[PDB]
Structure 1
């Protein structure tokens, strides 16, 4: 029967037995009887009444009101009256874009931000640096622009790809997201994922190779910055100061996935440094490296985030890690609870949106299929109650862009599974069901077509064409 098609599903909906043909905002109050992230929207035959506990809840309420107006535009007979009392299950609901692999122009970022805000996402994670490119401008290091932001091709396509954001563009993005209720989280991978950095500044590395080029294929790089060189730390101080000036969130994602340490083992500087500090192997050196980086961030008033590694030992209680490996989600939950860490659920089994969403679509020889229903199966706590898994801050979906060269491909792979991620991050389990979500997404096809002029229809053969083989 008559109901709302709001994604994510509100925490409480009470429908009433008459129809409203107008959603004109008649009242808009800030009330202390709601949490700062909660709202109450009342639909009456005369219009809508919005109450919110704060600016964040008001932004969420306006998103819900937009979805209601999009529904009303398609139902000339009107939508049901009622009362929506809403607040999120988790305070962290994030998407990650990967401009390092493929640069994303500022206007495409604005469109992406608008779409994710329509679904009450509040975290935007920028994977700014990797082997295939460096997108963060740092004063005093212009080769990052002239070398590390340009690559000759991508997987042998013979087409150069390049791009780097300006400080002004990044501050514009920050203000844009803030106006839409989204905090921006930069990621600067270290000490690895630095082939582009090595192409730009080989003297930062244990074995400088002047012929090093920015990587044009996937895979791992053995090139780690040398922790013994003072210019490395001067450079990272400069990077962190730029991040402090640009991104007010004060959160810096350092990557932190297990790096191959063969070159550290061979490095004469690092060899004598390990001997001098009585370090047994290169994992103690990695611990010392991350301790130094964390001290630097803390002196700047910044806080680190990591891709979780169970037996890394580089973490301090209170810090935040991401669960990402296939089938390690519950183990990561329990390990972080033991170690006093906070956890963000980004498990590749449910949250990696670079994987094909329909079986048979391009998998590039390794990607498994993550359907929309599979995605919606995601419970970030994995059956545990909030009183038992209170250290879980929320959900995070990465859209890795090795094979996503423009916004069209990016949005094709990101949606509509990002809607499922949003509902998993926002809606309590009591109001979640695959049937309701499927109905609502069927309506949201037209909602998105009307509001963003974007086509969310997904068939096996309607994915935009690629240039690779």
Structure 2
């Protein structure tokens, strides 16, 4: 048999017809079609009144999206007696084998029925439902001249990995609450279920800490390239968490330590050996900053930050970073990371950290390794300790240029086009581990505007999203590429300023 890899498309990027991404476990089409009309209602029914109330909220979220493009005023009804022309969302009789996020979605001429085990699975299934309707449905304004049809069809679905995440770096360049909510919303449509906020680095500190107010008054006032920076108040952070929760997305906040800490060091002189504030940094250098690993003030600082952040962050996890601590000795790093893990645990939070944080003698089997290095030896400690691993290989570093000539992006992991972002498996990155899942990382050294974020995340994130959701055996670039071409109008309709990748 003959095989080949993909080259660029001759003559440039290519960028009744559902466009489901990520690819579901099964999808069949039959004769006939459902028509969504102005008289449609969404019916919801759970196993008890509390569950029905949760489904009702999901129902309203769906109604809002459908109403924006159809111009209809679809409303939601708590009833298990859907009428012809209805969408029906239920958790009664879910197939347990599909787990918390899985669902069946069956469309007949008279009814759309989504059957899940949990409300979460109804929400994920609703992302597929939107992709079954014609392109145009994802517009934010009313679309005329499109019949709102869904083919008779049968879908069953569940994720391969539990953790399918996106990290946004808001330290290198700041992004507004609205901008962050938008990226969370867009990602949710592709079944991304985790959002990691990189809230602090050398160039800025982005979260209000009431006990150390100069973290904002001094530490938030810049970014890479000398823009004004910005920050989130605790109320704003809680708002982001709530917005994510409506999409069944867990928010994991990161305070990077002991490295990548210049903004803290520029805010409080007492965090430095000479007692003087560091000058703020607006360059892109890394590795030079460190907290004082053998001073008690360091641990008081970390405890105050963790106390305040834990109080406003419902996720059981806090990310404490641990990358590029090149101004911290191996011995001091081991000690520091163990000490801060104990603090986090005392506030009821489990610790996530970048490699090599798993090597800390203070780690527990409840700590999580975010494996970014993905070398043969990375996560040896994590594996021995039974720690879950989140993988972020080069293929998930979405801030890499698509190509040599990309106008934005970095290139220290090489180039990552839409094909490279697809053609990998988490088991490539680390062997013999408990792989919790995947996280796409969008560092922002070179991204200033929302358009920059869109360009780099779309279509790259779609590739990563499918790697997290769809089983390896059902992933195939030639298949995905053609599906992505079909999906393009939907990206346009969402107002995503995507890159028309010439490999698609």
Task: Tell me the TM-score normalized by structure 1.
Answer: 0.85
* Structure-2 residue corresponding to 1:359: 404
The separation in 1 between residues aligned to 2:27 and 2:432, in whole angstroms, is 26
Is the alpha carbon distance of 1:366 and 1:27 closer, same or farther for their aligned partners in structure 2, counting shifts above 3 Å?
closer
Answering whether residue 495 of structure 2 is matched by residue 453 of structure 1, we say: yes
CA contact (8 A) 2:358 2:382 kept: no
* CA displacement at 1:177 relative to structure 2: 0.2
The equivalent residue for 1:36 is 100
Deviations 1:61-84 (A, max 9, x none): 111111112448597595432211
SS of the aligned residue for 1:94 comes to: strand
Q: How far apart are 1:454 and its partner, in Å?
A: 2.3
- 1:188 matched to 2:250? The reply is no
Out of 325, 329, 339, the residue aligned to residue 259 of structure 1 is: 325
Give the direction of change, closer, same or farther, for the CA distance of 1:76–1:331 in structure 2 (3 Å limit). farther
Provide the C-alpha distance between the structure 1 equivalents of 2:183 and 2:390, rounded to a whole number of angstroms. 21
Pairing 1:381–2:424 present: no
CA distance in 2, matches of 1:77, 1:131: 50
In structure 2, the partner of 1:275 is none
1:436 to 469, 479, 483: 479
| Bigger shift: residues 30-39 or 54-63 | 30-39
1:458 is paired with a residue whose SS is coil
Superposition misfits of 4+ residues, deviation over 6 angstroms? none
**Corresponding residue of 2:65:** none
Residues of 2 paired with 1:232 and 1:206: CA distance? 11
Q: RMSD value over aligned CA atoms?
A: 2.5
**Deviations 1:207-264 (CA, angstroms, capped at 9, x unpaired):** 3333x222111112533222343332222111111111111003111111241246xx
The residue that corresponds to 1:342 in the other structure is 388
Question: Which residue in the other structure is 1:15 paired with?
Answer: 29
1-side partners of 2:148 and 2:358: how far apart? 59
**Contact 2:198 / 2:254 at 8 angstroms: preserved in 1?**
yes
**What residue number does 2:364 align with?**
316
Residue 226 (structure 1) aligned to one of 289, 292, 317: 292
Q: 1:296 to 1:367 in 2, by over 3 A?
A: closer
Distance in 1, matches of 2:429 and 2:306, equals: 38
Give the whole-Å Cα distance in 1 for the aligned partners of 2:480 and 2:451: 24
Match of 1:64 in 2: 128
Q: State which drifts further: 428-437 or 131-140.
A: 428-437
Residues 391 and 110 of structure 1: CA distance in aligned 2, closer, same or farther (over 3 Å): same
Q: Is the 8 A contact 1:445 1:456 kept in 2?
A: no
CA offsets per residue over residues 423-442 of structure 1, 9 Å max, x none? 00001123221122112212
Counterparts of 1:209 and 1:418 in 2: how far apart (Å)? 42
Number of the residue aligned with 2:467: 424
Change (3 A) 1:334 1:284: closer
Cα distance between partner residues in 2 of 1:26 and 1:254: 43
What is the CA distance between 1:28 and its match in structure 2?
A: 1.7
1:338–1:366 CA distance, 2 compared to 1 (3 A): closer
- Contact 1:445–1:455 under 8 Å retained in 2: no
Partners of 2:115 and 2:21 lie apart in 1 by 19
Cα deviation for residue 364 of structure 1 reads 5.6
Q: Which moved more, 1:395-404 or 1:353-362?
A: 353-362
| Aligned counterparts of 1:235 and 1:128: Cα–Cα separation in 2 | 16
- Say whether the 8 Å CA contact 1:22–1:47 is kept in structure 2: no
Q: What's the TM-score once normalised by structure 2's chain length?
A: 0.79
CA distance in 2, matches of 1:364, 1:225: 27
Give 2:213's aligned residue.
Answer: 142
Distance change >3 Å, CA 147–CA 371, structure 1 → 2? same
Between 1:337-346 and 1:360-369, the stretch displaced more is: 360-369
1:176 to 243, 258, 264: 243
2:233 is the alignment partner of 1:166: yes
Give the Cα–Cα distance (whole angstroms) in 2 for the partners of residues 405 and 127 of structure 1: 16
Number of matched residues? 428
Q: Which secondary structure state, in structure 2, belongs to the residue aligned with residue 121 of structure 1?
A: coil
1:286 Cα deviation after fit: 2.1
Aligned mates of 1:201, 1:86 — CA distance in 2: 51
1:13–1:85 CA contact under 8 A, matched in 2: yes
Over 3 Å counting, the alpha-carbon distance change for 1:25 and 1:353 in structure 2 is farther
Bigger CA drift: 169-178 or 187-196? 187-196
